[model samples]
Target chain A: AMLYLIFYDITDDNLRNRVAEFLKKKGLDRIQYSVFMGDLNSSRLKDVEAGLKIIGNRKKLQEDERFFILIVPITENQFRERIVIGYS
Target chain B: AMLYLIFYDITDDNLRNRVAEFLKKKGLDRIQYSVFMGDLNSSRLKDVEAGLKIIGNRKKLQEDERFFILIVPITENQFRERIVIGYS
Candidate 1:
């Protein structure tokens, strides 16, 4: 019933692409590079967790390879209060 | 008094270094690399913008150079609703 900021870092493109594809399928809104904003209730949210882990754990290597993803929630009202100073 | 998620991208190490110092002095909580959670009022927020512009506008080059900072507001209530599924 809230918004979650989702971002990740992956070792290879194969798995990296999967995370990107998977999040998309799970109704994640792409806002930045490797970053997405998702909206889901508890049921949908936890269900997506299993799918995210499914790809996160399917790394190309055990050591020297990494796939870390983060999911943090925030309010819609709070998100609307964003101020951008891109160039001016 | 609200929580703001602050993060940026800079070309040079000097600008990057200054951002690190400035945010620290601004009483921002360092959570991730180049990302910080800040607490400030409307007046204080405007103050931070001046310094932000100072460093952001100090780019050596205009075309190839890039410096962008994001100041986003998020509620403490929503931020507390975080869930992680790293592995297994």
Candidate 2:
């Protein structure tokens, strides 16, 4: 969770919850419907990173049901300078 | 833009479309359902920043139609280091 933002779109209900639970268990903060923010050291980062791949890789989606996820890094400067326009 | 990430939850159809169209017109890249990423100089950035407020500020949302939006910045280093696990 090293200041990373995890965004995802899991069509499957169970799969979606699994991913959400994993992140919550890891103490990530919810940023949006499909986004979470938190800090993860290398150990926790790799663990959560790998955890996502495993949760996601354990997949075989139908035509419109698929996995969509992204783990993007965020610098402190950027995080501090964020301009939130609404009560998100 | 300016490497900022725009994520939103506009409960109104026209308003939601306006936000999406605004981003598209400004040449931002769609990163997810409600997320867009791109580069914008200060001139363009301020323009778009004000744009969002104008659209979102014209508001008096219902109980469940609350507007939720966030403009978060991302550094070049963070953007470059982003890890994409799937085709999001």
Candidate 3:
């Protein structure tokens, strides 16, 4: 399954709010609190950079450096077999 | 960084058809109807708005307001970390 994703520690409610606010400023809203997906240009890498810029400043979020990033453009076949309704 | 997504309430079969027709007019064919992922340009949004106008009077749909729109650009790394394969 190939899709862009972001992770940040929402330990403090205030930090969580800040993250959400940042997203809104960037013209993005979460469909799911921790998960979001939408139009992304080819600069998949640049977008991540921007996210880091925002998350880094938030101490509560930055404290959780376990955050990671990925850009996966899986083939159609892979998606069909690997990512379906529910794969277990 | 984020993708532009549009959601609409499709309760009746005809409602879906109308949406599909609108998409087609805007040069977008459904990769999947219930779920669609395609390059939707600014003009496409206009086409969708036009389509909604057509469905305004139809019983199938009429500004039921169940639709939602959002733009999201998630960090790719986060997606990768949370997503791991565990073969059963």
Candidate 4:
């Protein structure tokens, strides 16, 4: 299976909710979110990036140290071994 | 429509040109190149990763700060609308 991925800092609830709405609209399900980890796909990544761009792009994000996003294509082998199953 | 994204430092012409050529061969067009940004796909991402591996195995590229690849998928309403207008 191909892995779609993103990492975002969750200090802002509005940004987080917008991301969740965008993910839901994009037909990506089996979603997971946290202060930490989950599955991601491209549309979701773009949504998050666009949202961060609203936060004065990368520099503003870095200044506040409150939010960030790491978007990429990942394989299960890359993350699954690292994420413990059902900790919540 | 899905786009793959990569970001790299292009201080080396050799590696940069090789990537340009590889993108051409892979049937991904509307090709954009720069000191940064463009569309990329999975197989193309793999090829680039393999090429980088030949250089560092992991350590040298970061040490040299000469090159890197960041891969992710993308889709755009504007770009998707733009592509069909082309006859070339």
Top DockQ hit: 2
Query: CA lDDT, every prediction?
Result: 0.72, 0.77, 0.40, 0.43
In terms of lDDT, the poorest run of 10 residues in model 2 chain A is: A57-66
Rate residue B83 of model 4 by lDDT.
15
Arranged by TM-score, best first: 2, 1, 4, 3
Instruction: Give the candidates in order of lDDT, highest first.
Output: 2, 1, 4, 3
DockQ of each: 0.43, 0.47, 0.02, 0.02
- Reference-based lDDT, residue A20, model 1: 87
Candidate 4 C-alpha lDDT tens digits along B1-88: 3454443334466766865565456554523342122454456556545654453333334433344443444445322422110001
Q: Give the DockQ (C-alpha) for candidate 1.
A: 0.43
lDDT (Cα, tens digit) per residue for candidate 2, span A24-67: 99999987666788888889988888888887775464666667
How much is the lDDT of residue A15 in candidate 3? 48
Better of 1 and 2 by DockQ: 2
Each candidate's number of clashing pairs is: 0, 5, 14, 2
Please list all clashing residue pairs in model 1, or write none if there are none: none
1 or 3, which is superior by TM-score? 1
Give the CAPRI class of candidate 2: acceptable
The C-alpha RMSD of each candidate to the native structure, in angstroms, is: 4.0, 3.4, 14.4, 12.1
lDDT by residue for model 2 over B1-88, one digit each (tens)?
3578777766687888988999999999987766788888789888888988888776564666656667777866777887766522
Instruction: Give candidate 2's error at residue B73 in angstroms.
Output: 1.9
Colliding pairs, model 2 = A1-A39, A1-A40, A2-A39, A2-A40, B2-B40
Residue A42 lDDT (model 4): 54
